[PDB]
């Protein structure tokens, strides 16, 4: 049963948190200086691997928390809820920054991860659904793409307008739930055990472990659902305001399994869109998206 | 004159036991003498009730009434002591639990008139009372759905008891 | 189509006359929003009179009456008029300023003469095309 | 004409606590990135404007001293120069205002 996999998957996620917490003895104070343009030069003494950038935002004002989606730690993008590691220089990133390219990637990746969660639970337990990977496509493409391999039983089934709406309802429920994006750095050995069943995920885990000298891999968890991430993700699911599953395109060479690439569009609350604009964007997001 | 609002800030709780949740901070601040009407000040107090510290400050900054500026100054003083003396870690983690205005001692004068009449002149003063609870403002009330309303009516009907019988 | 200001219609002209003279001397004046809008139309029309030419007798009469200080008359024909010869309009820029804290809370706005040597006002800037929403629209533009 | 009877506090309380008579909240409040202070969407920031406006007075004070007399408005264009900046050929035939301060970053 799928619940069994989530239960054991959730536990290993919890055990890793305990090991990291046990790894750090006592509370270590790290001096972090605010390099952000606003309120520059403020220095916070923080507990190592215990506090997060959100705590610093709480320290200053609520405006920081609402408008801060990411943090620049020593010039590196850090999640708002990622525990701090050392004394550093911290700056807050907003949706309206001059260069939202780093922010765009995190929003792009987070949307793909959320879509993957919908697919696995959307289908009945009778059918077998295996997620292959989340292809990285530019924002210019007009839609975020997620690839999934279905069971032979679903070879002849194509989503209808109502079925696509059902996926958005699941996505909308997740946004309504407002589940924070948990972040863990896990070794390949543990990650392989967590996702041993899905061979496609296994190779993706191997690639990330291969690139870096260690076996540490980036894992993100939304509630029970867990997935690997190419980079930082959105702090919470409530950020998205508009969500739509534009269309699904079936890859022709899909004999061993039916591989479908799902097209979707989402917009954050900070960036609302007019009714006509969204309709055209959704229409432009129903076209097959190639990777370039 | 009574100054029991300040005494509420001097209350010291017993040391908390290990099996007890971390007590949320409560701060009582007031300005005893303001040359302003309590009734006019009450309108400002009523609107800000239950709002966050930051949200209230933003509204006050763009408020046209003189009392609003005084309220913001009072709010800032309470926040400063809260961190300095009430061990508040986060400045933003504050909300307006209570806000009200009270009467203050006035001054009496005779109001002359150009036509030989006279009147009773009063210089009004008022007190302003606010209690701040550490943490975000509580979530707003959600209106009851039709399902909720119907269930109560049915429950009331079942709860009905026979009257004046064996 | 005309606001009621001052103690009478002639006072409005005198009040408008004083405001116009002050703007020319300094090129940037702050006043109530309602009054600033009323004087904006006159300022633009005056520049047209300046463009007409110094030798124009009507322009000289108009310039003399509206500008109490006569040193400004050479400036209009030799500074203001030459500067805007290329432009066909929109000589004056009016922007909203936070209301006065003078216990009356009147609506405040700043009216300035364009092309001036004064420090640039903090004008609003539209969102950059690098924003996520703008980038998506750019993609639609490229496809079309 | 006086009321036939005193109006009850309960009746009075309802009138003054009616939502129509209560103070309304504003949702158009915005933040100023430049000064880090609050602003309205249709109202420019004032903390930065104070620098520009007060800077203008300093420039105006220099201009007033340079003219030295009433009704002395030049018939030629005027330009402002700060320390470290030297007049160019294009600046020829233009009134020049000299400021001891260095060229401000915001001013271009």
């Amino acid at each position: 049963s799928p619940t069994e996999l989530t239960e054991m998957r959730n536990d290993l996620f919890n055990r890793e948190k305990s090991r990291q917490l046990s790894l750090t003895p006592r509370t270590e104070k790290i001096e972090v200086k605010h390099v952000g343009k606003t309120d520059p030069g403020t220095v916070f003494v923080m507990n190592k691997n215990i506090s997060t950038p959100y705590s610093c935002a709480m320290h200053l004002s609520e405006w920081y928390c609402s408008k801060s989606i990411l943090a620049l730690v020593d010039g590196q993008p850090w999640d708002m809820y990622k525990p701090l590691t050392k004394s550093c220089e911290i700056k807050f990133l907003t949706f309206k920054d001059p260069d939202p390219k780093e922010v765009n990637k995190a929003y792009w990746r987070s949307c793909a991860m959320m879509l993957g969660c919908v697919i696995e639970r959307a289908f009945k337990d009778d059918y077998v659904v295996s997620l292959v990977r989340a292809p990285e496509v530019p924002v210019i493409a007009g839609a975020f793409c997620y690839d999934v391999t279905l069971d032979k039983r679903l070879d002849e089934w194509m989503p209808t307008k109502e079925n696509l709406r059902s996926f958005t309802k699941d996505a909308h429920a997740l946004i309504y739930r407002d589940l924070p994006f948990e972040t863990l750095d896990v070794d390949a050995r543990v990650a392989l055990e967590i996702f041993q069943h899905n061979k496609y995920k296994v190779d993706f885990i191997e690639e990330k472990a291969s690139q870096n000298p260690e076996r540490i891999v980036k894992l993100h968890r939304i509630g029970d659902f867990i997935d690997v991430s190419e980079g930082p993700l959105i702090p919470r699911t409530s950020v998205c305001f508009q969500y739509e599953v534009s269309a699904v395109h079936n890859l022709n060479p899909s004999q061993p399994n039916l591989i479908r690439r799902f097209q979707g569009l989402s917009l954050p609350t900070h960036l609302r869109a007019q009714f006509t604009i969204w309709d055209k964007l959704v229409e432009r997001s129903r076209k097959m998206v190639t990777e370039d | 004159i009574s100054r029991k609002w300040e005494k509420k800030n001097k209350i010291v709780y017993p040391p908390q036991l290990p099996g007890e949740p971390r007590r949320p901070a409560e701060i009582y601040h007031c300005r005893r003498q303001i040359k302003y009407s309590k009734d006019k000040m009450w309108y400002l107090a009523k609107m800000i009730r239950g709002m966050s510290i930051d949200q209230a400050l933003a509204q006050l900054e763009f408020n046209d009434k003189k009392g609003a500026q005084i309220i913001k100054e009072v709010l800032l003083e309470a926040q400063d002591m809260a961190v300095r003396d009430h061990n508040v870690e986060f400045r933003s983690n504050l909300h307006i639990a209570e806000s009200t205005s009270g009467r203050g001692q006035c001054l009496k004068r005779i109001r002359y008139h150009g036509r030989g009449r006279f009147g009773i002149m009063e210089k009004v003063y008022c007190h302003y009372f606010v209690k701040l609870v550490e943490g975000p403002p509580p979530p707003p009330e959600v209106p009851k759905t039709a399902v909720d309303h119907a269930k109560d009516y049915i429950q009331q009907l079942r709860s009905r008891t026979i009257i004046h019988t064996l | 189509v005309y606001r009621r200001l001052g103690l009478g219609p002639e006072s409005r002209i005198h009040l408008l006359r004083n405001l116009l003279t002050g703007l020319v001397r300094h090129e940037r004046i702050e006043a109530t929003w309602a009054r600033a809008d009323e004087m904006r139309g006159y300022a633009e029309k005056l520049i047209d009179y300046g463009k007409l030419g110094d030798t124009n007798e009507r322009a000289m009469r108009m310039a003399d009456f509206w500008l109490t200080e006569k040193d400004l008359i050479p400036k209009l024909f030799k500074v203001l008029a030459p500067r805007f010869q290329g432009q066909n309009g929109n000589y004056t820029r009016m922007l909203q300023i936070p209301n006065r804290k003078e216990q009356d809370r009147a609506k405040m706005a700043v009216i300035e003469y364009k092309g001036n040597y004064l420090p640039p006002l903090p004008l609003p800037h539209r969102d950059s095309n690098l924003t996520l929403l703008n980038q998506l629209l750019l993609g639609l533009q490229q496809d079309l | 004409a006086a009321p036939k009877n005193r109006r009850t506090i309960e009746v009075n309380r309802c009138r003054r606590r009616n939502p129509q008579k209560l103070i309304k909240i504003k949702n158009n409040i915005d933040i100023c990135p430049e000064c880090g202070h609050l602003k309205q969407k249709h109202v420019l920031c004032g903390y930065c404007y104070e620098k520009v406006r007060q800077e203008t007075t300093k420039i105006r004070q220099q201009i007033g001293a340079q003219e030295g007399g009433p009704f002395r408005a030049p018939s030629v264009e005027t330009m402002v120069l700060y320390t470290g900046e030297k007049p160019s050929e294009k600046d020829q035939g233009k009134r020049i205002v000299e400021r001891n301060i260095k060229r401000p970053s915001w001013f271009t």
Partner: peptide, 30 residues
């Protein structure tokens, strides 16, 4: 602040994108 804000269609539309939007609306109407 987690509070409602006022927005309009032209709030976040750039000058280049704004011109494109006007052309698109005319095309849709036609």
């Amino acid at each position: 602040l987690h509070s409602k804000s006022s927005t309009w269609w032209d709030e976040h539309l750039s000058e280049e994108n704004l011109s494109f939007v006007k052309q698109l609306v005319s095309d849709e109407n036609k």
